[PDB]
Point group: C3
Chain length 61, copies 3
């Protein structure tokens, strides 16, 4: 069970890396059309959910 | 162990929020070029996988 | 506990499917502007993190 939870955690940490890579790409795509001022709130939500996850990951470890 | 599974669940729920935010952004980006008729199947898969996850999250709780 | 870890795993597997769908869409969006030569490294990271996750998923099962 313990080892199993360890694996699940690593899976989640790796997926978070994937998530951040897609976020970075999306921003690049957005930046193409012009300024990202209209994505301020979107950015705020992404940042906030990312913080929650970092907290949870740190807590799980 | 119990508390640990609780954390893993919250991590997964937060990541799902991130996932849906990237999906929403992607759709906005697509909508820029024009109609999203060509993404009907893509949308169907996204919706279906999202349902599975909602079911699993509800079940885990 | 055991059944709970099983659910968490399925949740993670479903989210990975979602992740790969967003990656595929992002690539399509990128391909619109032209060649994706500038995304070689981005692609390498996505592929590498996806491999880690596949390994972890296989190991968890």
């Amino acid at each position: 069970i313990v080892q199993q939870q360890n694996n699940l955690l690593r899976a989640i940490e790796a997926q978070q890396h994937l998530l951040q890579l897609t976020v970075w790409a999306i921003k690049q795509l957005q930046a193409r059309s012009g300024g990202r001022g209209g994505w301020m709130e979107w950015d705020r939500e992404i940042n906030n959910y990312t913080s929650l996850i970092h907290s949870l990951i740190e807590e799980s470890q």
